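Researcher: Predict the fold of Sorbin and SH3 domain-containing protein 1.
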Amino acid sequence: QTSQDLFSYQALYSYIPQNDDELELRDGDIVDVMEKCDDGWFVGTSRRTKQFGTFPGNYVKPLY
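Model: Structure tokens for Sorbin and SH3 domain-containing protein 1 follow.
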């Protein structure tokens, strides 16, 4: 409302971590950004096993 947090996104497809900082992403997974990187990607926590990994925020889309 006034404060307003960040938002959640639903992933287009599944993603496999290449870096130990990245998140294991599954098709249609929801992500919430832990921190925004000004280079274009965010950190995020997976709805699956509640793990937090970073990956492109333009790789995921608004919740369907």
